[PDB]
Write a protein that binds this ligand. Sequence first.
Ligand SMILES: CC(C)(C)NC(=O)[C@@H]1CN(Cc2cccnc2)CCN1C[C@@H](O)C[C@@H](Cc1ccccc1)C(=O)N[C@H]1c2ccccc2C[C@H]1O
Ligand SMILES: [Cl-]
Ligand SMILES: [Cl-]
Ligand code: NA
Lengths: 99, 99
Amino acid sequence: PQITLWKRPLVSIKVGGQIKEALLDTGADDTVIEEIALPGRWKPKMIGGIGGFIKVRQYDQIIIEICGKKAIGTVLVGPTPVNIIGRNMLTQLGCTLNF
Amino acid sequence: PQITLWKRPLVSIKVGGQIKEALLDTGADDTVIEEIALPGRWKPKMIGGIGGFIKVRQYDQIIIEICGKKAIGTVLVGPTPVNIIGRNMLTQLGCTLNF
Ligand SMILES: CC(C)(C)NC(=O)[C@@H]1CN(Cc2cccnc2)CCN1C[C@@H](O)C[C@@H](Cc1ccccc1)C(=O)N[C@H]1c2ccccc2C[C@H]1O
Ligand SMILES: [Cl-]
Ligand SMILES: [Cl-]
Ligand code: NA
C-alpha cells in the first residue's frame, strides 16, 4: 500500500500478545514500545533523540504484526512517549520513501 | 526518488540560503534544524522528543529545496541532534511511505 503523511502514520500492531497503536517512523533507527511484557532475556541500551537519552530494555527476535505483515526482530521496551516502529522493522516490511 | 531504509534517509537540503544534511522523518510532525540564521520574526515553542522537550524558535513561510522539489512552511530552529524534515514539509514534496 501507500501511506500519505497529511496526518501521523499510525497503524495497529500486535506485540506481546497485545494490540497497540504505533508510529511508522523513518527517523527512528530502532523500534521502541511502552512498558509491556516480552519473553526471554534482555540487554540494556541507551537510545537518544530530541531532548536526550532514555534507558530501555532490548529483547531480540520478537514477533510483531504490522499492517497484516509479520516481522521478527529487535524490540526495545521503555518510557517512550509513543510506540515507534523504526527502520529495523520497516526494512523487514519492504518499506521505502517515495517522492 | 525511491529511498530504502537500510540506513538513515539523509538528503541534502537548501534552506536559509545554505545547504545542509537532513533526515526524512515520517514520525516527526515538525521540521527542525540546528542553529541557522533565518529572516523574519519568530515565536518560541516547545517540542517533545523521545528524551523530552527542547525549546525552539518558530519561523513561518520558510522555503526549502530537496532533490529539485521545493516546499514552503514552518521551520523550527533549535538544539536538535540531527536536522529533521517532518511531515509538514514531506507532504509538500509529495513524499509517501510505500510497501
Ligand atoms: C518534532 C520532533 C523532531 C521533536 N519529533 C520527534 O522527535 C518525535 C517524537 N515522538 C514522541 C513524542 C514526544 C513528545 C510528544 N509527542 C510525541 C517520537 C518520534 N519522534 C520522531 C523521531 O523519528 C526523531 C528522531 C531524531 C533523531 C534521529 C537520529 C539521531 C538522533 C535523533 C529520533 O528520536 N530517533 C531516534 C530513535 C527513536 C526510537 C528508537 C531509537 C532511536 C534512535 C534515534 O534514531
Ligand atoms: Cl531487528
Ligand atoms: Cl507548515
Ligand atoms: Na533514520
